[PDB]
Amino acid sequence: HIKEKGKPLMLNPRTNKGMAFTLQERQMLGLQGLLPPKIETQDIQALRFHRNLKKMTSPLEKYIYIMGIQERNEKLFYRILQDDIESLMPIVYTPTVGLACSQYGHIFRRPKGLFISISDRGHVRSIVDNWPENHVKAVVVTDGERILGLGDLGVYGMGIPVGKLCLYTACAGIRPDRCLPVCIDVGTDNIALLKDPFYMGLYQKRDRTQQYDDLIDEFMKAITDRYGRNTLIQFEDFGNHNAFRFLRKYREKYCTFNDDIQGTAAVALAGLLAAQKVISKPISEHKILFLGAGEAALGIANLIVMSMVENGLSEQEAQKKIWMFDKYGLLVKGRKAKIDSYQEPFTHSAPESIPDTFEDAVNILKPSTIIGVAGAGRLFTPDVIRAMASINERPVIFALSNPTAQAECTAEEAYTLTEGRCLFASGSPFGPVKLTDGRVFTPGQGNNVYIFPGVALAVILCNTRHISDSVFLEAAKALTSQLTDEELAQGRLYPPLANIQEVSINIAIKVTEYLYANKMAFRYPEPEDKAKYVKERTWRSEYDSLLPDVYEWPESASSPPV
Amino acid sequence: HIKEKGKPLMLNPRTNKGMAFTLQERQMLGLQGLLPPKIETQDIQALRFHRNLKKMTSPLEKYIYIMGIQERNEKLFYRILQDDIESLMPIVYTPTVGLACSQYGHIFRRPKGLFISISDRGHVRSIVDNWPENHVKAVVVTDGERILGLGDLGVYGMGIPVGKLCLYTACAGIRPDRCLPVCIDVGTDNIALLKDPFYMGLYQKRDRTQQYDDLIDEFMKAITDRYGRNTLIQFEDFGNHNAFRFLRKYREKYCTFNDDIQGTAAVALAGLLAAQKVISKPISEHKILFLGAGEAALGIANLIVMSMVENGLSEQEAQKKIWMFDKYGLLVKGRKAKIDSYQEPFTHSAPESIPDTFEDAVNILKPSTIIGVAGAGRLFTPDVIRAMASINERPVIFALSNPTAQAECTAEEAYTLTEGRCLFASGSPFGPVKLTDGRVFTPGQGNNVYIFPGVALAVILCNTRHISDSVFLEAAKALTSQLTDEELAQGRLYPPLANIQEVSINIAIKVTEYLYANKMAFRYPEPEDKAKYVKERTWRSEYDSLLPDVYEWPESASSPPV
Amino acid sequence: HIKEKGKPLMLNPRTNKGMAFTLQERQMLGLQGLLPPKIETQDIQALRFHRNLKKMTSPLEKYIYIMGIQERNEKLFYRILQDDIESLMPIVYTPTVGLACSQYGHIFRRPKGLFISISDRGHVRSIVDNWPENHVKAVVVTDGERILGLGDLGVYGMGIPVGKLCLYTACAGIRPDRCLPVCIDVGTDNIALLKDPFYMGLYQKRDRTQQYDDLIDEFMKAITDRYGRNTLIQFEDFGNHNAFRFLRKYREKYCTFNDDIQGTAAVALAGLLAAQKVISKPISEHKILFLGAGEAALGIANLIVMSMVENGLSEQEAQKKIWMFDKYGLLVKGRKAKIDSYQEPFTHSAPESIPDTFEDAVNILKPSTIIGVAGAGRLFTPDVIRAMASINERPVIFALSNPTAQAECTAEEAYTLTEGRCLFASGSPFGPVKLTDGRVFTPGQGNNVYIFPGVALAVILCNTRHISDSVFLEAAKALTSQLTDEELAQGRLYPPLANIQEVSINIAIKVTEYLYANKMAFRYPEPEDKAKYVKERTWRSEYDSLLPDVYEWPESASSPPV
Ligand SMILES: NC(=O)c1ccc[n+]([C@@H]2O[C@H](COP(=O)([O-])OP(=O)(O)OC[C@H]3O[C@@H](n4cnc5c(N)ncnc54)[C@H](O)[C@@H]3O)[C@@H](O)[C@H]2O)c1
Ligand SMILES: NC(=O)c1ccc[n+]([C@@H]2O[C@H](COP(=O)([O-])OP(=O)(O)OC[C@H]3O[C@@H](n4cnc5c(N)ncnc54)[C@H](O)[C@@H]3O)[C@@H](O)[C@H]2O)c1
Ligand SMILES: NC(=O)c1ccc[n+]([C@@H]2O[C@H](COP(=O)([O-])OP(=O)(O)OC[C@H]3O[C@@H](n4cnc5c(N)ncnc54)[C@H](O)[C@@H]3O)[C@@H](O)[C@H]2O)c1
């Protein structure tokens, strides 16, 4: 049921088609004369915008162009996004979305998403009621505090949820109606933004008192009051500590998951399973040394332990295979540095040497896998890579810190200081590495877009209210299952991004099959086959006919005379 | 979220308040000057319309007035309807709605409901898409073929679903948004309507070919395609044969129930349980003789047998206690008249006398309960009542045929030809009976409004897709449980209509508790207590504040100079 | 009366304010949360967009930016346009609008204006009825056939009326509601546009049959049928012959004027009056030699003759002072080349030498003023300029052909081959000229924006139905009257563009005072002072308060009890 006609129909991106309005539905809907005479298809529109896009050279001009397309016509926007997804995820999402936020601030002409300020505390529900859309299933919330590679940006961080929500629809098929980007702005610590008179938000510094926590609680309550307790809420580019503690707080009472703790863990585990298929030995035979003992490292280690346990190994024996190296030093029993409750499982009896630097820890533990999530910088020194290559026939090196400037090492050093026998994976993109021997090795990129769209779609479709830790184990197994035998022969650890739209759906299916198996899905009746269930509820970018049904009634009896 | 402002806000019955618009929300919403200066409450509005209504004397003038109120303001309409519900159900619903349809045709100024003609076959889905409301949970469908007491009325029967849907909201609390009245018009057999030039529908006779069945199938498919497979669809005032066979056809694949077969059975069973509490002996000790062997009689008998079985009695022993008397004669094994499959359970070894008339059957079977659902007329002859009073100390007489002109007997003859020891219940309303002895006996009225609102609410809230036969057994038990000890002492078989709005809710709770117990509810998580679950989802007729939230921001830092 | 609320209010450029929405009218209108928290004024918005605009370097990027601003917020767009009008007329209008049309085709996201194709013939009125705005006073029509400096562009020429209509509001103050840009597309002769599959119009060549004339007549009739007989209609960038003959055809029955024939004539006459104030001798003492005998030359000559006549000189004596030099040769009586009716007034008895080239004509006629409107190219050869400087103490040279590539000469040659005593004026912009002597001469630019906004405003305000030839004489006198004594001392022939918004208004006043004096104004009662009349009806770009009037009623008597 479309209730619009004429010019309003073309001012709504949801119902706009541009020139794809056929002649008969131009004439019946009152659009004749308001559009140029040509009748086009969506293929022609997509081709026009694709070549206009190839003519452009900077990523940021491409970003402005493609978001303008999103604002004028959303079906065409998502068709263009799905057509060339590998080349446009770096544009629509990180890293270009952060540059767009930093430099052009708020490009958008239309109001996309809510702005909730600390000045609105006690009245968040009215702000949420101002949003026209009545059914939203996914909410992405930003603080602006930690933009990836840009730092604090305040209100300008609003472009980060928007872009991310695009991926929700471009890869998973979540309806754009059902997505709400939110910016919780509590001030900014960026003095550059506090000095200029054209900053678009509060001119105070970040509120770090109890008012911030109360505002977050009130916003969560308002969102789930209007939209339901099973609304998926993601905290995107919050402060690191804030994001971690909010994930702990709202994990049980709300449907939230984190990409930094849970998505990164799932992607790292998928890479590890791919590596265990590439190399002869399984994941249980590995010995993992972590660089960093934060909550992202703990999430990855817990997921690895769950994977080890499900393969027949005991929990304690699994945890004895993971070693974690803090900034202070190796986590061992009896060290003078403070160790909290969550690092207790991975605190082990100290080795004889008691290493003080990371390279010494690599030499003394002889670990097969090395995983860097510290985020400090180039902590994977060349000596570390050389020691890894010497100890292991085929070392597994994971530099999961992002952006590139914060990665533990780059693919070039990893693949050169080794003879190419290392299985290197990184969060940040890297170019293929060519050696003097003549071979070319492409490093697997642990993109978070592998996990969160499929998991979000499965959670939204199944009416899940609590996203557990084993959902991401199932997602990691599903992601690994997408790799073919020839891909493993070529040494790829992840499926190519070019078919993410397929991979995501497959992931969703597996997660769906898990959620109904573990009674964490509240959408009944339970579908007989989950694949056909999820594949008919994804959003299609094909235009819908707006043509009124005009037909002739069969002739009936004549009306009687008066 | 209200998206309207100014005059449109007062032209929508859903958002209109009339003078209950407070001054501040008159000024903020642009209604100042468009309303008379007085500020009123809903109590004052209800009082004004109540006395204007008492001034009126004919039921039909009252009907026109109250439907005008519904068209201008729906919250006030339902508040007035709930305030005096016992006196306004006869006005909003049968019998006055049939008189309104017959005489004033289509009173309504607003479009309420869909008109689907046989001329629209093959294009029903477009008609359904023309309905603005996106979520409807209850659909009431009429043919116009059998209006209760009026006969065929064609398109003019459209007023029957409308009125019935009012009860859905007045007693059960179903949202008026979620209700859709439909008229399937396939012509009329009423020659008076075929002769006048101002009849509002097709001027053909009723289509009784396969096109009618195909149209009904297409309409069912279109409704459940747009609104979901668990949409509740009720066929109201269809032809008797058509309604029965459509109930059989769509019982399994759609969420449908019938008031004539299932609601009448539930009400009769509730009366029988009340009578078993009034008299010493239980329902199993009774011997039931039915007048009529149709599908309504079979539904009542099957529900009675289920009730007998659940109380410890065997199924065959239960069915041996019900005797059914057809027009041809008593259903016995070996009679020359044809007996179909559904009457096989209640076909018994013939008694010695083999009675040929109904009064002889009463004399020879000595039945404690007598139930008339034949619909022929005054078949409960005075000799039948006298025989019942002589055989039984306290006979139970049920004249469930309606309207009054088709009832098997009236309360006056039943209570006079007996000394007042009969427990008489009838579908049609009757006045209290006073005898020369001085006592006054009020006959229990088996109103269908007891069952269908509560059952409809429980089915809608639980996302049920198939309404079984034991749902109505649970509803009958719930209805009987509403009677207090003093009410049973006074001889009432049904709770008073004056608190139907309460009774219905209680019925809903029980049905809800049944549906979750038998895994026929698909709304999860399952509520811990069903009473609080259903009582917070019913529709309240209290006005909602439209006042925008206006507040002052706390003072923050000054904007920097340029 | 604003009937919108919430998000629609910000999706309408007419009512959108962006952050200029005050807090109280954010909260009352349902915009809270949909806008960033900052409250801004229009000054802050204008400053932000001004510096964002200075950061840009190419004119075309500036065009895209400023038209995006127009699409999101029109009051801010016109405030920015009026703030820096001298630097943004070259961007909003020619020459940058033609480059935008050629290269980016149709930038616009919103539907601005109507597209009427030859395929819609016989149904133009329905297309006109599709336009939402009910009162439009000015219509600018384009063919796309002759874009200034770009040639045929077909449908892509639609950007030319749009830009021109901006000037209508930026200089004159005509309401943007009242403006309708139209593109009559009858095919294109541009083979580049006929080859590519992404051209936005008909893929046929230009229809030059009677169907084109019939389409133009039908469009004129439809526009004046919907909007009134006094609707101002301007044919913009039509074919040269088509524009001239359409001006002749519709001059009497419609309210049309032409910028090429009438605006150019008015601007040239204003320059000539300024020159007659700069030099001692008046316009009657001059002898004018024209280069070109087209209809633009004839319009300029007729306006010059009218100006000469109104100063006491006879008509025949006035026409004997203008000489016109065709491509074939000097217009003289008895030449073998064909001379039509309109060149008869300026065909004179041949001089003795009978010159064959233009330089010889300059030598033999000794003309004080030289005016080039041929449009061929650099026909003002250096010998012509040298002869002009030798014959006249202060020659007047007018190179009114545009663009620069078609100008008869450039300011540098004109001011250098003379010692700086020439009064050079050109249609196309030129840079200031510096000589070795050290002086700097700025050439007066005969911009058409001097005349058409003020004349259009005066015609629209006075309800004029026929724009005569003396309206432009009055406009030329008004334009000349804007020059101060010091400006004439410095040698300027036209008022600076930086205050066009003022000059236009003054022109309007004079034209208004003329129209009421000659009974060509149909808006009555006639205003006592025309200045205050026109200055209170111009459109102001200041934001209008949307705040609902909220107040407290004085306490009155209490409502009585029931
Ligand atoms: N033209 C339209 O706007 C249009 C047309 C048809 C249906 N719908 C919508 O379809 C919905 C029907 O719901 P259902 O019974 O199929 O739910 P469902 O049982 O199939 O799935 C369960 C939950 O998942 C949600 N969901 C389903 N698909 C989704 C998707 N691609 N993206 C995000 N969320 C999704 C659903 O809203 C629902 O809450 C209606 O709410 C209706 O508004 C809209
Ligand atoms: N101003 C408004 O219009 C407004 C305000 C609040 C909520 N709502 C509506 O509330 C609904 C929320 O659904 P829910 O999660 O509470 O479903 P639910 O889980 O509580 O109940 C299950 C089913 O029963 C339906 N239902 C619930 N109450 C009903 C009633 N009184 N009458 C008829 N049907 C009823 C529901 O639509 C749902 O399909 C939204 O669809 C939303 O449109 C509307
Ligand atoms: N919020 C609004 O939209 C709003 C508010 C106030 C007035 N108006 C408009 O003002 C108009 C009143 O007309 P009037 O009696 O003052 O005419 P008028 O007598 O003052 O002028 C005569 C003609 O010139 C037109 N005109 C006047 N000013 C114009 C301008 N700046 N630009 C273009 N055309 C102009 C007029 O529409 C009229 O047709 C109403 O049509 C009404 O729609 C609109």
Tab-separated table of C-alpha atoms in Angstrom, chain A residues 12-15 70-71 73-79 81-82 110-113 131-140 161-181 227 457 460 537-542 544, chain C residues 7:
chain	number	residue	atom	x	y	z
A	12	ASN	CA	10.771	9.805	-0.871
A	13	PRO	CA	13.930	7.720	-1.413
A	14	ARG	CA	12.009	4.580	-0.452
A	15	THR	CA	9.464	4.957	-3.268
A	70	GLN	CA	21.414	7.015	-1.235
A	71	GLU	CA	19.540	10.211	-0.436
A	73	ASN	CA	17.002	6.725	-4.425
A	74	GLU	CA	17.656	3.910	-1.961
A	75	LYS	CA	16.924	0.858	-4.129
A	76	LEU	CA	19.379	2.140	-6.723
A	77	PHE	CA	21.874	2.965	-3.977
A	78	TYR	CA	21.804	-0.582	-2.660
A	79	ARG	CA	21.899	-2.068	-6.156
A	81	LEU	CA	26.476	-1.008	-3.542
A	82	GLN	CA	25.809	-4.714	-4.115
A	110	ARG	CA	18.157	14.370	4.742
A	111	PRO	CA	17.744	13.577	8.442
A	112	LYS	CA	19.096	10.055	8.880
A	113	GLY	CA	19.092	9.004	12.517
A	131	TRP	CA	11.471	9.105	14.615
A	132	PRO	CA	8.844	8.427	11.914
A	133	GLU	CA	9.592	4.718	11.391
A	134	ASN	CA	7.489	2.494	13.638
A	135	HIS	CA	9.281	-0.863	13.271
A	136	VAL	CA	13.057	-0.772	13.591
A	137	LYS	CA	14.921	-3.995	14.291
A	138	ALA	CA	18.538	-2.779	14.357
A	139	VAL	CA	19.903	0.286	16.151
A	140	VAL	CA	23.534	1.359	15.790
A	161	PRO	CA	26.429	4.323	12.175
A	162	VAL	CA	24.863	5.437	8.886
A	163	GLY	CA	27.614	3.843	6.830
A	164	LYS	CA	27.573	0.711	8.960
A	165	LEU	CA	23.823	0.377	8.556
A	166	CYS	CA	24.376	0.464	4.798
A	167	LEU	CA	26.420	-2.716	5.123
A	168	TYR	CA	23.571	-4.221	7.151
A	169	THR	CA	21.461	-3.911	4.017
A	170	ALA	CA	24.167	-4.380	1.399
A	171	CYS	CA	25.465	-7.709	2.721
A	172	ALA	CA	22.733	-9.177	4.924
A	173	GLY	CA	19.539	-7.841	3.373
A	174	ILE	CA	18.099	-6.062	6.403
A	175	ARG	CA	15.368	-3.636	5.405
A	176	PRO	CA	16.609	-0.017	5.481
A	177	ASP	CA	13.314	0.926	7.154
A	178	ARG	CA	14.274	-1.193	10.117
A	179	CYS	CA	17.598	0.539	10.757
A	180	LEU	CA	18.091	3.537	13.047
A	181	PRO	CA	21.448	5.323	13.414
A	227	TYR	CA	10.472	-0.876	19.505
A	457	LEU	CA	20.264	-10.862	10.116
A	460	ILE	CA	16.714	-10.143	13.705
A	537	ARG	CA	12.986	-12.476	4.088
A	538	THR	CA	16.084	-10.623	2.911
A	539	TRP	CA	15.523	-7.253	1.281
A	540	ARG	CA	15.640	-7.183	-2.517
A	541	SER	CA	16.852	-4.056	-4.300
A	542	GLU	CA	14.645	-4.659	-7.343
A	544	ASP	CA	8.446	-2.755	-7.085
C	7	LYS	CA	10.409	15.347	9.384
